[PDB]
Amino acid sequence: MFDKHTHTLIAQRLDQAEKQREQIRAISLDYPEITIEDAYAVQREWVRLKIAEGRTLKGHKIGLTSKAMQASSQISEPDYGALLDDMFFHDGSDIPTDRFIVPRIEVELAFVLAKPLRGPNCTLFDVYNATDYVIPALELIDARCHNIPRKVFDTISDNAANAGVILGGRPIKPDELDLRWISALMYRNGVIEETGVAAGVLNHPANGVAWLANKLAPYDVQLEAGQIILGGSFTRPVPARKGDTFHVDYGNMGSISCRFV
Amino acid sequence: MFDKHTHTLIAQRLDQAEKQREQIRAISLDYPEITIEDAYAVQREWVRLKIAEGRTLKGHKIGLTSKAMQASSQISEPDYGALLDDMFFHDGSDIPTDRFIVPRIEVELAFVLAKPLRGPNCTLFDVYNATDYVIPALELIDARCHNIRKVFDTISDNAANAGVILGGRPIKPDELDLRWISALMYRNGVIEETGVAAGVLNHPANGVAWLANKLAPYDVQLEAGQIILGGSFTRPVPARKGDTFHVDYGNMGSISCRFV
Amino acid sequence: MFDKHTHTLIAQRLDQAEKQREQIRAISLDYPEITIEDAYAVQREWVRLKIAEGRTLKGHKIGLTSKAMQASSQISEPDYGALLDDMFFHDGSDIPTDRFIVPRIEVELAFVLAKPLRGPNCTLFDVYNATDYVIPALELIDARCHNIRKVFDTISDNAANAGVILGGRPIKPDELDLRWISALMYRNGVIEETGVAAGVLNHPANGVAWLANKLAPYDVQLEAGQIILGGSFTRPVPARKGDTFHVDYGNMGSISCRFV
Amino acid sequence: MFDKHTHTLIAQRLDQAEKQREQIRAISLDYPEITIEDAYAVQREWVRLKIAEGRTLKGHKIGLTSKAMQASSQISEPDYGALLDDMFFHDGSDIPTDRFIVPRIEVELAFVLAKPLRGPNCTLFDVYNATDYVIPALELIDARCHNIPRKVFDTISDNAANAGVILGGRPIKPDELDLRWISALMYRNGVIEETGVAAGVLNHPANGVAWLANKLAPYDVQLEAGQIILGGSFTRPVPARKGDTFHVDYGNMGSISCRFV
Ligand code: NA
Ligand code: NA
Ligand code: NA
Ligand code: NA
């Protein structure tokens, strides 16, 4: 573990990278001995910094769910990041492309909590009990560190690649239908680029939420009522470029659209 | 276009590559001016040779459907290959890994034809009229050429064909919306890929009509009784000795196999 | 009834059998006058020891449900065992085969309690009232005693408990008729067993009420938050290194794992 | 392969065993070199003998489907036998226990053909096209050879253990519902003894029918229109004893009952 001073410095550089839309060198290259604990400490510092600037915590996301599952990727479990108020964009809105560096769109489900979730021993059943609504959600992810390589410690430090969130479609009670079989078609500029099924997220798209509550418990942190929790992408991320229209069709769960300007 | 004898020569090399389970150099490297027409001519020659050896044509597949669709891929349209009787394995079979080189599993839908389909101007509606049943189908794809322009290699190599595994629930085309058939591909207990049938050319029947139209100028049609695989809704997943696969198509049933 | 010290001694032997993955002689052979009361006393001692070592009680299981029902089996009623935290594996996990002796997979339904259940006179309706969710659950059972009267060995051996794997679709008890939940157990791509939930004591919730009633005289109840496995709808299937399991509960989802 | 004379002799002994309700020695013990081809030839001879006596061919069954599938059984594929008119008992009827030796009840689905099925290259799709109705069916199986051992060649010779058939419940068109998920509870004397799901029969309960048509093709034999084809048991066989009542509940597919007297 590094000194807190080091964590703060790395966070400051990530912050400047985001604000200037200019990537820094991969943190893992400058800090070869960085640990997963250091990476989450950098994240916590950056989130603290951004909230001090006037932002508000609105929830969390669980990421790297596919890579955590797939056998031929070295990664052993998912990651997590914090969602801030300024990350949220309305369904059907213009997204300012110049605000981002290498943005990509992911297809997810969001859990809107009615009740807090606190670890350890948080279970899928606790998630069901605490969830007010499930709603489709797109994530816009980005990278403040250069890719050419980059590692998981860099992504985690970099607030798990968080940049944007777009909620939309049909809100449902958790018991309304089997969440495992929610499916989606991601269109970009009139063409299907990816498809996926929600079970591709950790066997059940709610599993990440309980896992997250358990990860946050040691820090005396819980998932608060009113928070929005993004469970993971059931598609590979798709690059977003200026002029692109996205339309993600979740069938009977509705759709989410946006345009990059 | 190369002369017929060159097409026969390349086909013979691919044939021995398959039989010996030993990859040859990419055809496009050895023949730098190979065309798409040459590639299909090589494929035709190889299929002819394999049928002469005692195999029987059972259908066709449409491949490279995702790449054809994807904006950032150079591939402009799908490819096709011939399905032969010895490519078919039963649901829940042990699959001999040693017979293959670098096998990968794809998740598809098969169209079992009751009537012939002939181009040009074959349409989605023609496909529906001619289809007896739709059934889940896995493809096992392979490569007889070394991996490390390259579309010509794949096409010559009978569009990567190697195996087919049918299984699950047979349905009439009109039973449900084929576009929203969804699948989870498990390997060794873990979901490796997921996908939805609309990912195959917007409608999984579209490739069938497209194929009939591609074959028409050669005085070839899709025959009654043929099985047509329309494209994969997932990226292919490597198959290795010891692997079990289970592909869950929800209410459309499942297909499983084990590599031994 | 044996003295407490004898119960402790037998429990210690079972504990070392589990830790060393080395079977001991059947307890009923070494103690020919062992009773059912002794067997549960041994189980209680072993659970106490394992909890003292740092494990936590997470629930219970009801076993031997089919034998209890079958007319041609001597077993008159089900058995029960304690489920501990280190027995639980996630859906889609690699399971370490070396940790077990002769592991077998069973197909069950779990009841996740929102409220306590206490006997005597606990009923099906009490179970429904106290259950938060029902979810598919696999059990991995094992034997710390050599196989080649014998019910006493199983009961002492914590009712063959070893592993638990939850997965699939969580439902409220009232969502559908639990009696007709059905499953296909695949191992290595092939269906080895099938069964229907009503095969568990006529209704898969019945064992939960039965268990509460068995535990009451010991001043023990089923606690809120506990996971109760009610019995297997299939015969157990051996698990060996390299095996993949996939248990398809239809619209109730699936549970999978691989033994490594 | 034995001489036809040998096949006829074995068939005659099986016939006497059935008529006298007295088991013979396992054929494989008396004929150590017997092949699967010999076993089906013995079967064909016995069926010919029984039809010459005045019986009529009503269909076929596919058996040993579970053992053919399970990894820890040596058997590689299913078996088949011929169903004769006198094997059929009405739903809800008394079954004369004295007519049988060691009878056991199996739980199956029957396919009633509207059109003939001829191999080779008969497919599941041909079965669907030729099937008029699917209906629940119980099989009563028996053994004319002693068990203490007996092998597959003995069972096949012994007309694949055929003895009885009981049709009942709800007839459906093949396309009415997914046949794979038809499920059943077998009660004997008020107690559930076995349960099972139809997919346990070769992954699809119709698969055996196409397989059978393909097996019969070399003999210039086809499955005829009007024939009843039993696809295989999705339960282990359960002994039937004098005084036993059976009730097999196929849920929304109805039930079949009988009593042994
Ligand atoms: Na991984
Ligand atoms: Na393209
Ligand atoms: Na009993
Ligand atoms: Na077998």
UniProtKB/TrEMBL annotation, chains B, C:
EC number: 4.2.1.163
SUPFAM superfamilies listed in its UniProt record: FAH (SSF56529)
Domain Fumarylacetoacetase-like C-terminal stretches: 77-259
InterPro entries in UniProt: Fumarylacetoacetase-like_C, Fumarylacetoacetase_C_sf, HpcG, Hydratase-Decarb/MhpD_sf
The keyword Lyase is assigned to this record: yes
Top EC group: lyase
GO cellular component, one term: cytoplasm
Binding-site residues for Mg(2+), renumbered to this chain: 106, 108, 139
Single annotated GO MF: metal ion binding
Signal peptide (from-to): none
The keyword RNA-binding is assigned to this record: no
Keyword line: Lyase, Metal-binding
Name of the molecule in the record: 2-oxo-hept-4-ene-1,7-dioate hydratase
